[PDB]
Structure 1
């Protein structure tokens, strides 16, 4: 879908923290509000706290989850059972 010339997309605020956080050995969960950032190869090995709307759900990225958007691996709404009307 997304054009070629444009490429991928990160907010570059997430990119800067990831570069800083990968150099630092004692990595901790990275609190990012950017559900819009696509997972870049360098992201591999870090863990993020994506804002589902209410809380920050923790996602551990792998060498496989690479390519999709960072908010795609977290939910936003919840539905598990209806209730008999009558």
Structure 2
């Protein structure tokens, strides 16, 4: 009932080089990692590692909706911009390999009202 990603425990995933890990993710993530991180993602990763070290005890808010979730990010809470606000996301082990923006919906669910004038041929 424990967590395993390709037959590897969480600890084994922690002690892996970036290149080693990329061989287990899908093709899209492997290509994205192979091309390197953008500067904004570099700053976000620096803040994340600083928080892991025991410093920076503040909320982590970001605009980087295209950041890929990494094993070392598990256990934290991140606030991802959705267009008008930062929503909290609690990272679970099963989120490895997904984009952050997948957990911050940008549109509100639709509840239709009564059709108005012009909705049918006879209503015009």
- Give the superposed CA RMSD: 2.2
Q: Deviations over 1:3-27 (max 9, x none)?
A: 7455366511111000001111684
**In structure 2, what is the equivalent of residue 55 of structure 1?**
85
- Which has the higher Rg, Structure 1 or Structure 2? 2
Asked whether 1:7 is paired with 2:33, we answer yes
Greater RCO (CA < 8 Å, at least 6 residues apart):
1
Tell me the TM-score normalised to structure 1 length.
Answer: 0.84
Task: Considering fraction of residues, name the structure with more strand.
Answer: 1
Q: Deviations over 1:3-58 (max 9, x none)?
A: 74553665111110000011116844311111110001111011000001011000
The partner residue of 2:94 within 51, 58, 64 is 64
Asked whether 1:24 is paired with 2:54, we answer yes
Task: Considering fraction of residues, name the structure with more helix.
Answer: 2
Query: How many residues are matched?
Result: 86
Tell me the TM-score normalised to structure 2 length.
Answer: 0.60
CA distance in 1, matches of 2:87, 2:56: 20
Q: Structure 1 unaligned runs (5+)?
A: none
Q: Structure 2 unaligned runs (5+)?
A: 1-26, 117-124
SS at the partner of 1:16?
helix
